[PDB]
Amino acid sequence: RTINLYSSRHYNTDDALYDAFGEVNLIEASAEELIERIQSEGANSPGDILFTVDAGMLWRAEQAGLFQPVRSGKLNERIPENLRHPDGLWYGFTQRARVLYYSRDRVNPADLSTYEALADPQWRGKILVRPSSNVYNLSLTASRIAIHGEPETRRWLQGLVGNFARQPEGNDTAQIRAIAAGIGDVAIANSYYYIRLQKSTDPADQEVVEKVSLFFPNTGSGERGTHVNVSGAGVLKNAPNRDAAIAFLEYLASDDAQRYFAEGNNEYPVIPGVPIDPVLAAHGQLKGDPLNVSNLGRYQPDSARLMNEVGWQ
Amino acid sequence: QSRTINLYSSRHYNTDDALYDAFGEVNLIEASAEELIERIQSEGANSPGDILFTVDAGMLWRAEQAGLFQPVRSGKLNERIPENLRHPDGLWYGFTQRARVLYYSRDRVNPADLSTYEALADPQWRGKILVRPSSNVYNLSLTASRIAIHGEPETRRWLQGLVGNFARQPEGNDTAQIRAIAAGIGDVAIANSYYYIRLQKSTDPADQEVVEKVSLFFPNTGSGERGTHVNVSGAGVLKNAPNRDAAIAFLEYLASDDAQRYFAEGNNEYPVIPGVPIDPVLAAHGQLKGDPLNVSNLGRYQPDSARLMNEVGWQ
Amino acid sequence: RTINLYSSRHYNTDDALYDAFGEVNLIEASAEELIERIQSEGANSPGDILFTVDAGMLWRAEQAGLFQPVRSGKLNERIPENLRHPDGLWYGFTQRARVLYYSRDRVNPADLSTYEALADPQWRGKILVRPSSNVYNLSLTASRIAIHGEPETRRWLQGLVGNFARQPEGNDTAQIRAIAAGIGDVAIANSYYYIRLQKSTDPADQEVVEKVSLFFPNTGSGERGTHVNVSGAGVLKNAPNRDAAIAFLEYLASDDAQRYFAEGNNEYPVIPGVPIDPVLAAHGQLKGDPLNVSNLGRYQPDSARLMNEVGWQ
Amino acid sequence: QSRTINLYSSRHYNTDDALYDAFGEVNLIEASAEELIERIQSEGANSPGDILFTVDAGMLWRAEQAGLFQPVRSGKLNERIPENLRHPDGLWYGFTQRARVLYYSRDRVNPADLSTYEALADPQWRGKILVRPSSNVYNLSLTASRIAIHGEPETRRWLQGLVGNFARQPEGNDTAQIRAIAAGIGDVAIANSYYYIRLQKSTDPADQEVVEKVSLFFPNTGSGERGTHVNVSGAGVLKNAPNRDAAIAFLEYLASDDAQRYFAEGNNEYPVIPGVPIDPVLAAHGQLKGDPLNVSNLGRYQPDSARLMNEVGWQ
């Protein structure tokens, strides 16, 4: 089995995982760069699979026409419907949650509930989130548009931005560290960043863990579930090894591969029953929003528009 | 035993460990610039950090604004480091420099039509300009430099024209803009110099295709223009540095010819010291003619830059 | 689950494999260095597990008194008896084969059979093997002493050395490349080195693969099987986390972990039925000698003595 | 475009890539020394290798014996590289040097009792000496140097006494011998200088314990003794080098002060060029006083060394 895999994700157990499959010739760059490279390659791309992170980036690839639909009984049986494209263009293989982090000292978790509630006036001066250009934020806002519509999402964004502790700066972990530094009290950031800190041998990172806690939002009655997003992949339009490409996707969905692929970046498998990293699992069961993740891409342009309209820098 | 310091750096190239070992025992703490600033803030008045090294005068300024640096007075640093590549009050010092240049489609753009950042606001560039999001510090610093030079009203008008000429709403990183030219998405990108050097050095045929399709153009070097926009990576001694003398000694060492040469090589950047050999691939693009603006201006007008870029709709 | 793992083996999927278990604090050095470090640590070693490569090195650790015996129903059920110490002091977790490589152009594989036959006069000037100080060679010779006794092993060594293409020099892959360079015709080296070459993207390494083939010796009637050896581990005498240490050993013997742990260095799992790396598997079924691998250590001193007696440098 | 060469090297420290980039396009092929020699042999008369760089004069000699090198005549190399650290016929050149020194138990050995390699054959060292197996090229080269200096009969007698004093049959690598002293297995080890520097620099408390328990002693520096045994890592231009002029230029570059400093740092070795700063941790052990023996002697008597070591039972 041989394939040319273009991937914006690589951690290093991946190589034993890929070897077990066959020859996987890896091409690596950032997601936007790989999409553009494939675009440049016209009808002659040697790529079989594009693997990237965030349904918002899969949508950018999809928009550029990069994928061919595939029909695999195995992928359909195993991968939850809401974690794959309705037309079979791409499939999620890991998921992450965009959670809340809070100051243990300064925030009672009983006062937390939903993303939507962070627009409430009590959070004035307290909210930490990275810039609006980031695809994780584009996708969270996109999910809110899918759920609530544009007017309601605008009102939420207006409150949320109003409550910023500072103009967005830094990456997701920068928001977590900002709580510990006393700059703000509640941050929105992905789950796996906190697991990194917990696993760190750096005593400074343990200080952050001691001071800041993880809270899963939106798990109460009528709240839908925590926002989830995926890393995943689809078969490229002109894939020279189409059978092998589909076989690779099926392999990535296998119990063995799922377990250690998800471990790579402290993410959750997409396959139920596959063991979850113990440090991640100790935070509790993931109760994800059932929204089809294709909606994260669908409302990406509207999300950028609304976030910029209300002054989220 | 060796000189010792605690170096907090957002820059590391595998290639730097021998540079540091030659100095002494450099205990390296690494994280993104914003994270390091926040870590030091958390550590408070007894932080053991000796030096913060980071990339972009805009990041040094964020550190400065958090009150992280103490001023140092060093004859060697003053004599060697160009005055405009260090803070006027001795709070921090540039050790490498990069240029924010233009990239253009060889097939679709005639470089005679290029000149300055300012001219990219001309209506002929409608639907042609590629640049990454306004959140990025390299952009914040380029705009900050235009404010320093032209004032806010002029700079606002330039931003309006520039944004009006975007080929698409900003997405992806600097190299993504260069690749977007190759892919036919736009025709002129703004990105740093060293990203193109990476592509030239790459063994990947697809990277060589990009360098075949796109060329590097140094803007603002014409008669009566100031010079290309330059920015630095650099460092200062932290306010309550436990190893203050060693920290100053370390800054002096980083300014030495031996260290400058290979420190700059690490990321295909230019040394700040004149006469220190420049990477041959970078040097083949010609002599850097940098704007003499003191790089502290890049941080000084950072808030203004973020405000104006957002006002005009640079996403 | 937390343990202090001293290991002379590390490949980088190991980290996702270890994370799935718990916190595995890794200490790494060469095998002899780790044994000596533990010796220095007296009754105060923080180590829970010593993992090392070659039953000959496990024996050196065992000789230094470093292990405590453990009794695990799971290890006993799953790990073949011949791949673990009879007294439960240590357990193999991967295996390798010490095979023959031959010049495709110059050697007909029909002329190959056993290690023992390489002492035959037809191999004069043709045999390539690394120096006698190497533990892989110590263990192969040790197995011959276990099987044939010392007098017969001496006669074999005398013929074998007589047939050397050159005085031993270089590592195992150096012997493989030496065939391709025309220096000799048959080399003795481990299986996984050739798999490395096959997986290499370097066109020079593919030239070696095109010129040199792998042959499993000793698989005919009455030949016992190919010489095998293991990488494995035991619980340290003063292990501070004994329950966790045993749990880690059991985890290393699990189907999931076995698959990708063996992939790390292109080795075979010790557990039957666990998928084997496809490039390795394409060479055929491994038919290993059933000799208990504790014998490889047991006769190590005699092996060094005999090899040096007959002039194997 | 850049100068280009195909460098086959058995040495690489992450730390070298910036050193090579400063030169030009250095296409690096890496493998163990013996493997590289065999690869080049396989490639035959039209091998594209420009330079073979390897570690130990004994490995350069194996390359020489395979007829892999052409002689080069370079004024800069001749003027800069000490005559005794390069081949008399210009076939290859040392670029770093290491010393094969003694290590001793601080608690159990008084360094006044140490002097020369030769004295370790004295019966007082019975059951005390630690050294790695005779197959190892560092040992082959040390013994080869004694043959060059003393002749075979004297050297044989020295080997007999040395082997008779082994604390255990040789096992493990160089650092294993240093650790074996700490573990109480023996009291005096023979190993290279840079292995101890690694331990000193290590953040692992167990490594610091070894350096607390074991000290480095430079042998053969006494009155009327020749100097400590030194050996080199080094390179020559390959016989049918496609880029011959660039290859020579590359050797000249590796001998420059800038490159020497950090090339030596990579593995805690000494530069071959006098005046080039030495790593501070290494330098704190004192000035290297090397034996002036031409290092080509280390390869010249390699077969003799292997024969005599095996004859006397050094396993």
PDB file of N, CA, C and O in Angstrom, chain B residues 202-256:
ATOM      1  N   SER B 202      15.047  24.790  -0.044  1.00  0.00           N
ATOM      2  CA  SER B 202      14.283  23.539   0.104  1.00  0.00           C
ATOM      3  C   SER B 202      14.645  22.516  -0.962  1.00  0.00           C
ATOM      4  O   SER B 202      14.831  22.867  -2.114  1.00  0.00           O
ATOM      5  N   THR B 203      14.701  21.241  -0.576  1.00  0.00           N
ATOM      6  CA  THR B 203      14.878  20.149  -1.523  1.00  0.00           C
ATOM      7  C   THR B 203      13.572  19.700  -2.177  1.00  0.00           C
ATOM      8  O   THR B 203      13.567  18.813  -3.067  1.00  0.00           O
ATOM      9  N   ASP B 204      12.461  20.290  -1.743  1.00  0.00           N
ATOM     10  CA  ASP B 204      11.156  19.886  -2.282  1.00  0.00           C
ATOM     11  C   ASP B 204      10.913  20.571  -3.632  1.00  0.00           C
ATOM     12  O   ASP B 204      10.884  21.808  -3.715  1.00  0.00           O
ATOM     13  N   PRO B 205      10.722  19.769  -4.698  1.00  0.00           N
ATOM     14  CA  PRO B 205      10.500  20.345  -6.027  1.00  0.00           C
ATOM     15  C   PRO B 205       9.360  21.362  -6.053  1.00  0.00           C
ATOM     16  O   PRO B 205       9.423  22.325  -6.838  1.00  0.00           O
ATOM     17  N   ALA B 206       8.315  21.142  -5.233  1.00  0.00           N
ATOM     18  CA  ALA B 206       7.181  22.052  -5.200  1.00  0.00           C
ATOM     19  C   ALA B 206       7.596  23.421  -4.656  1.00  0.00           C
ATOM     20  O   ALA B 206       7.059  24.431  -5.102  1.00  0.00           O
ATOM     21  N   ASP B 207       8.544  23.443  -3.709  1.00  0.00           N
ATOM     22  CA  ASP B 207       9.103  24.711  -3.203  1.00  0.00           C
ATOM     23  C   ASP B 207       9.932  25.422  -4.270  1.00  0.00           C
ATOM     24  O   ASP B 207       9.868  26.623  -4.408  1.00  0.00           O
ATOM     25  N   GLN B 208      10.705  24.650  -5.042  1.00  0.00           N
ATOM     26  CA  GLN B 208      11.489  25.241  -6.130  1.00  0.00           C
ATOM     27  C   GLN B 208      10.536  25.833  -7.183  1.00  0.00           C
ATOM     28  O   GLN B 208      10.854  26.837  -7.813  1.00  0.00           O
ATOM     29  N   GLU B 209       9.359  25.215  -7.354  1.00  0.00           N
ATOM     30  CA  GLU B 209       8.395  25.752  -8.315  1.00  0.00           C
ATOM     31  C   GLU B 209       7.940  27.133  -7.901  1.00  0.00           C
ATOM     32  O   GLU B 209       7.749  28.013  -8.734  1.00  0.00           O
ATOM     33  N   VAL B 210       7.717  27.309  -6.591  1.00  0.00           N
ATOM     34  CA  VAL B 210       7.317  28.616  -6.076  1.00  0.00           C
ATOM     35  C   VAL B 210       8.409  29.667  -6.363  1.00  0.00           C
ATOM     36  O   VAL B 210       8.101  30.780  -6.781  1.00  0.00           O
ATOM     37  N   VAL B 211       9.675  29.304  -6.126  1.00  0.00           N
ATOM     38  CA  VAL B 211      10.745  30.289  -6.339  1.00  0.00           C
ATOM     39  C   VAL B 211      10.932  30.538  -7.855  1.00  0.00           C
ATOM     40  O   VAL B 211      11.346  31.625  -8.239  1.00  0.00           O
ATOM     41  N   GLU B 212      10.517  29.591  -8.691  1.00  0.00           N
ATOM     42  CA  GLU B 212      10.566  29.812 -10.146  1.00  0.00           C
ATOM     43  C   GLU B 212       9.499  30.756 -10.591  1.00  0.00           C
ATOM     44  O   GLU B 212       9.642  31.392 -11.619  1.00  0.00           O
ATOM     45  N   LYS B 213       8.416  30.819  -9.838  1.00  0.00           N
ATOM     46  CA  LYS B 213       7.220  31.557 -10.251  1.00  0.00           C
ATOM     47  C   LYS B 213       7.093  32.926  -9.611  1.00  0.00           C
ATOM     48  O   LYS B 213       6.357  33.786 -10.095  1.00  0.00           O
ATOM     49  N   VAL B 214       7.820  33.113  -8.521  1.00  0.00           N
ATOM     50  CA  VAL B 214       7.673  34.320  -7.682  1.00  0.00           C
ATOM     51  C   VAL B 214       9.051  34.889  -7.433  1.00  0.00           C
ATOM     52  O   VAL B 214       9.989  34.116  -7.210  1.00  0.00           O
ATOM     53  N   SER B 215       9.216  36.224  -7.503  1.00  0.00           N
ATOM     54  CA  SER B 215      10.508  36.849  -7.183  1.00  0.00           C
ATOM     55  C   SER B 215      10.381  37.783  -5.989  1.00  0.00           C
ATOM     56  O   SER B 215       9.293  38.244  -5.663  1.00  0.00           O
ATOM     57  N   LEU B 216      11.520  38.059  -5.361  1.00  0.00           N
ATOM     58  CA  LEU B 216      11.590  38.950  -4.199  1.00  0.00           C
ATOM     59  C   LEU B 216      11.953  40.350  -4.721  1.00  0.00           C
ATOM     60  O   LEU B 216      12.871  40.501  -5.521  1.00  0.00           O
ATOM     61  N   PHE B 217      11.245  41.370  -4.248  1.00  0.00           N
ATOM     62  CA  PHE B 217      11.535  42.754  -4.599  1.00  0.00           C
ATOM     63  C   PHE B 217      11.700  43.563  -3.314  1.00  0.00           C
ATOM     64  O   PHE B 217      10.776  43.556  -2.478  1.00  0.00           O
ATOM     65  N   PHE B 218      12.833  44.255  -3.170  1.00  0.00           N
ATOM     66  CA  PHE B 218      13.032  45.171  -2.060  1.00  0.00           C
ATOM     67  C   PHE B 218      12.351  46.506  -2.351  1.00  0.00           C
ATOM     68  O   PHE B 218      12.769  47.221  -3.271  1.00  0.00           O
ATOM     69  N   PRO B 219      11.313  46.844  -1.574  1.00  0.00           N
ATOM     70  CA  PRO B 219      10.666  48.129  -1.756  1.00  0.00           C
ATOM     71  C   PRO B 219      11.371  49.308  -1.078  1.00  0.00           C
ATOM     72  O   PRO B 219      12.183  49.134  -0.162  1.00  0.00           O
ATOM     73  N   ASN B 220      10.979  50.492  -1.525  1.00  0.00           N
ATOM     74  CA  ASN B 220      11.332  51.764  -0.893  1.00  0.00           C
ATOM     75  C   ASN B 220      12.835  52.049  -0.913  1.00  0.00           C
ATOM     76  O   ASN B 220      13.347  52.685   0.003  1.00  0.00           O
ATOM     77  N   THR B 221      13.532  51.555  -1.931  1.00  0.00           N
ATOM     78  CA  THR B 221      14.975  51.812  -2.037  1.00  0.00           C
ATOM     79  C   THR B 221      15.288  52.849  -3.116  1.00  0.00           C
ATOM     80  O   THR B 221      16.468  53.179  -3.332  1.00  0.00           O
ATOM     81  N   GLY B 222      14.237  53.353  -3.764  1.00  0.00           N
ATOM     82  CA  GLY B 222      14.389  54.356  -4.824  1.00  0.00           C
ATOM     83  C   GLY B 222      14.864  55.693  -4.309  1.00  0.00           C
ATOM     84  O   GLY B 222      14.884  55.939  -3.094  1.00  0.00           O
ATOM     85  N   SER B 223      15.233  56.584  -5.248  1.00  0.00           N
ATOM     86  CA  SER B 223      15.634  57.958  -4.938  1.00  0.00           C
ATOM     87  C   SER B 223      14.604  58.592  -4.025  1.00  0.00           C
ATOM     88  O   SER B 223      13.404  58.467  -4.276  1.00  0.00           O
ATOM     89  N   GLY B 224      15.051  59.288  -3.000  1.00  0.00           N
ATOM     90  CA  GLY B 224      14.145  59.987  -2.111  1.00  0.00           C
ATOM     91  C   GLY B 224      13.254  59.100  -1.278  1.00  0.00           C
ATOM     92  O   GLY B 224      12.451  59.603  -0.515  1.00  0.00           O
ATOM     93  N   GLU B 225      13.342  57.779  -1.432  1.00  0.00           N
ATOM     94  CA  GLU B 225      12.621  56.903  -0.510  1.00  0.00           C
ATOM     95  C   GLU B 225      13.576  56.555   0.631  1.00  0.00           C
ATOM     96  O   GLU B 225      14.796  56.708   0.493  1.00  0.00           O
ATOM     97  N   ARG B 226      13.011  56.110   1.747  1.00  0.00           N
ATOM     98  CA  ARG B 226      13.747  55.966   3.008  1.00  0.00           C
ATOM     99  C   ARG B 226      14.579  54.698   3.110  1.00  0.00           C
ATOM    100  O   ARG B 226      15.594  54.682   3.794  1.00  0.00           O
ATOM    101  N   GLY B 227      14.094  53.621   2.505  1.00  0.00           N
ATOM    102  CA  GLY B 227      14.739  52.305   2.666  1.00  0.00           C
ATOM    103  C   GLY B 227      13.650  51.286   2.946  1.00  0.00           C
ATOM    104  O   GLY B 227      12.525  51.632   3.309  1.00  0.00           O
ATOM    105  N   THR B 228      14.010  50.013   2.817  1.00  0.00           N
ATOM    106  CA  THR B 228      13.059  48.943   3.036  1.00  0.00           C
ATOM    107  C   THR B 228      12.722  48.889   4.545  1.00  0.00           C
ATOM    108  O   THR B 228      13.566  49.118   5.389  1.00  0.00           O
ATOM    109  N   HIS B 229      11.515  48.468   4.872  1.00  0.00           N
ATOM    110  CA  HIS B 229      11.153  48.347   6.278  1.00  0.00           C
ATOM    111  C   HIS B 229      11.965  47.187   6.865  1.00  0.00           C
ATOM    112  O   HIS B 229      11.948  46.098   6.328  1.00  0.00           O
ATOM    113  N   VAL B 230      12.691  47.453   7.938  1.00  0.00           N
ATOM    114  CA  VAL B 230      13.387  46.362   8.633  1.00  0.00           C
ATOM    115  C   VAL B 230      12.805  46.198  10.045  1.00  0.00           C
ATOM    116  O   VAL B 230      12.149  47.122  10.595  1.00  0.00           O
ATOM    117  N   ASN B 231      12.974  45.008  10.600  1.00  0.00           N
ATOM    118  CA  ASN B 231      12.560  44.744  11.955  1.00  0.00           C
ATOM    119  C   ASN B 231      13.622  43.817  12.541  1.00  0.00           C
ATOM    120  O   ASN B 231      14.466  43.316  11.805  1.00  0.00           O
ATOM    121  N   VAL B 232      13.588  43.633  13.853  1.00  0.00           N
ATOM    122  CA  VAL B 232      14.650  42.897  14.525  1.00  0.00           C
ATOM    123  C   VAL B 232      14.149  41.747  15.349  1.00  0.00           C
ATOM    124  O   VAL B 232      12.980  41.718  15.750  1.00  0.00           O
ATOM    125  N   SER B 233      15.046  40.795  15.614  1.00  0.00           N
ATOM    126  CA  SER B 233      14.886  39.953  16.801  1.00  0.00           C
ATOM    127  C   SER B 233      15.934  40.441  17.789  1.00  0.00           C
ATOM    128  O   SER B 233      17.052  40.901  17.400  1.00  0.00           O
ATOM    129  N   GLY B 234      15.605  40.377  19.063  1.00  0.00           N
ATOM    130  CA  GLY B 234      16.482  41.090  19.975  1.00  0.00           C
ATOM    131  C   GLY B 234      16.194  40.758  21.425  1.00  0.00           C
ATOM    132  O   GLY B 234      15.316  39.965  21.714  1.00  0.00           O
ATOM    133  N   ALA B 235      16.908  41.398  22.329  1.00  0.00           N
ATOM    134  CA  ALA B 235      16.813  40.990  23.743  1.00  0.00           C
ATOM    135  C   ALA B 235      17.180  42.140  24.656  1.00  0.00           C
ATOM    136  O   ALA B 235      17.850  43.092  24.232  1.00  0.00           O
ATOM    137  N   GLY B 236      16.767  42.016  25.908  1.00  0.00           N
ATOM    138  CA  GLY B 236      17.129  43.002  26.942  1.00  0.00           C
ATOM    139  C   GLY B 236      17.337  42.232  28.220  1.00  0.00           C
ATOM    140  O   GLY B 236      16.924  41.063  28.349  1.00  0.00           O
ATOM    141  N   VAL B 237      17.975  42.881  29.178  1.00  0.00           N
ATOM    142  CA  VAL B 237      18.136  42.291  30.509  1.00  0.00           C
ATOM    143  C   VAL B 237      16.861  42.544  31.323  1.00  0.00           C
ATOM    144  O   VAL B 237      16.348  43.678  31.368  1.00  0.00           O
ATOM    145  N   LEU B 238      16.369  41.489  31.972  1.00  0.00           N
ATOM    146  CA  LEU B 238      15.164  41.563  32.788  1.00  0.00           C
ATOM    147  C   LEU B 238      15.413  42.327  34.085  1.00  0.00           C
ATOM    148  O   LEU B 238      16.499  42.241  34.677  1.00  0.00           O
ATOM    149  N   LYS B 239      14.392  43.075  34.499  1.00  0.00           N
ATOM    150  CA  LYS B 239      14.452  43.943  35.670  1.00  0.00           C
ATOM    151  C   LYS B 239      15.089  43.318  36.879  1.00  0.00           C
ATOM    152  O   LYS B 239      15.894  43.937  37.566  1.00  0.00           O
ATOM    153  N   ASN B 240      14.724  42.122  37.243  1.00  0.00           N
ATOM    154  CA  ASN B 240      15.405  41.765  38.501  1.00  0.00           C
ATOM    155  C   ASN B 240      16.377  40.625  38.271  1.00  0.00           C
ATOM    156  O   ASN B 240      16.508  39.711  39.095  1.00  0.00           O
ATOM    157  N   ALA B 241      17.057  40.673  37.117  1.00  0.00           N
ATOM    158  CA  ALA B 241      17.952  39.582  36.724  1.00  0.00           C
ATOM    159  C   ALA B 241      18.892  39.176  37.864  1.00  0.00           C
ATOM    160  O   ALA B 241      19.622  40.010  38.411  1.00  0.00           O
ATOM    161  N   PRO B 242      18.876  37.894  38.233  1.00  0.00           N
ATOM    162  CA  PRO B 242      19.807  37.439  39.278  1.00  0.00           C
ATOM    163  C   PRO B 242      21.280  37.486  38.857  1.00  0.00           C
ATOM    164  O   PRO B 242      22.161  37.702  39.705  1.00  0.00           O
ATOM    165  N   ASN B 243      21.536  37.291  37.561  1.00  0.00           N
ATOM    166  CA  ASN B 243      22.897  37.211  37.035  1.00  0.00           C
ATOM    167  C   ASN B 243      23.152  38.400  36.097  1.00  0.00           C
ATOM    168  O   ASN B 243      23.410  38.221  34.909  1.00  0.00           O
ATOM    169  N   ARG B 244      23.059  39.613  36.628  1.00  0.00           N
ATOM    170  CA  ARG B 244      23.026  40.807  35.804  1.00  0.00           C
ATOM    171  C   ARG B 244      24.284  40.990  34.971  1.00  0.00           C
ATOM    172  O   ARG B 244      24.198  41.289  33.768  1.00  0.00           O
ATOM    173  N   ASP B 245      25.446  40.871  35.615  1.00  0.00           N
ATOM    174  CA  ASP B 245      26.697  41.022  34.879  1.00  0.00           C
ATOM    175  C   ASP B 245      26.861  39.977  33.775  1.00  0.00           C
ATOM    176  O   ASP B 245      27.308  40.310  32.664  1.00  0.00           O
ATOM    177  N   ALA B 246      26.496  38.729  34.071  1.00  0.00           N
ATOM    178  CA  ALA B 246      26.563  37.668  33.061  1.00  0.00           C
ATOM    179  C   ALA B 246      25.586  37.953  31.933  1.00  0.00           C
ATOM    180  O   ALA B 246      25.860  37.664  30.759  1.00  0.00           O
ATOM    181  N   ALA B 247      24.426  38.524  32.286  1.00  0.00           N
ATOM    182  CA  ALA B 247      23.390  38.841  31.279  1.00  0.00           C
ATOM    183  C   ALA B 247      23.903  39.894  30.290  1.00  0.00           C
ATOM    184  O   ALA B 247      23.786  39.753  29.070  1.00  0.00           O
ATOM    185  N   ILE B 248      24.554  40.921  30.832  1.00  0.00           N
ATOM    186  CA  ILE B 248      25.138  41.945  29.985  1.00  0.00           C
ATOM    187  C   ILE B 248      26.238  41.332  29.142  1.00  0.00           C
ATOM    188  O   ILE B 248      26.315  41.593  27.934  1.00  0.00           O
ATOM    189  N   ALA B 249      27.057  40.477  29.755  1.00  0.00           N
ATOM    190  CA  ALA B 249      28.140  39.794  29.036  1.00  0.00           C
ATOM    191  C   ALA B 249      27.586  38.944  27.877  1.00  0.00           C
ATOM    192  O   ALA B 249      28.185  38.862  26.802  1.00  0.00           O
ATOM    193  N   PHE B 250      26.438  38.334  28.124  1.00  0.00           N
ATOM    194  CA  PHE B 250      25.787  37.528  27.125  1.00  0.00           C
ATOM    195  C   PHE B 250      25.346  38.417  25.961  1.00  0.00           C
ATOM    196  O   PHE B 250      25.599  38.065  24.810  1.00  0.00           O
ATOM    197  N   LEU B 251      24.703  39.557  26.235  1.00  0.00           N
ATOM    198  CA  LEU B 251      24.306  40.484  25.142  1.00  0.00           C
ATOM    199  C   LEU B 251      25.514  40.919  24.345  1.00  0.00           C
ATOM    200  O   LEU B 251      25.487  40.929  23.113  1.00  0.00           O
ATOM    201  N   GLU B 252      26.610  41.215  25.032  1.00  0.00           N
ATOM    202  CA  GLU B 252      27.867  41.572  24.330  1.00  0.00           C
ATOM    203  C   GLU B 252      28.363  40.452  23.432  1.00  0.00           C
ATOM    204  O   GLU B 252      28.832  40.691  22.291  1.00  0.00           O
ATOM    205  N   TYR B 253      28.289  39.230  23.950  1.00  0.00           N
ATOM    206  CA  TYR B 253      28.675  38.070  23.180  1.00  0.00           C
ATOM    207  C   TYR B 253      27.806  37.907  21.924  1.00  0.00           C
ATOM    208  O   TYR B 253      28.333  37.674  20.846  1.00  0.00           O
ATOM    209  N   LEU B 254      26.484  38.033  22.058  1.00  0.00           N
ATOM    210  CA  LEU B 254      25.609  37.907  20.906  1.00  0.00           C
ATOM    211  C   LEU B 254      25.915  38.957  19.835  1.00  0.00           C
ATOM    212  O   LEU B 254      25.565  38.761  18.669  1.00  0.00           O
ATOM    213  N   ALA B 255      26.511  40.085  20.246  1.00  0.00           N
ATOM    214  CA  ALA B 255      26.911  41.145  19.297  1.00  0.00           C
ATOM    215  C   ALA B 255      28.316  40.924  18.708  1.00  0.00           C
ATOM    216  O   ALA B 255      28.789  41.711  17.876  1.00  0.00           O
ATOM    217  N   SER B 256      29.001  39.875  19.128  1.00  0.00           N
ATOM    218  CA  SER B 256      30.340  39.606  18.594  1.00  0.00           C
ATOM    219  C   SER B 256      30.285  39.041  17.161  1.00  0.00           C
ATOM    220  O   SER B 256      29.248  38.469  16.746  1.00  0.00           O
TER     221      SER B 256
END
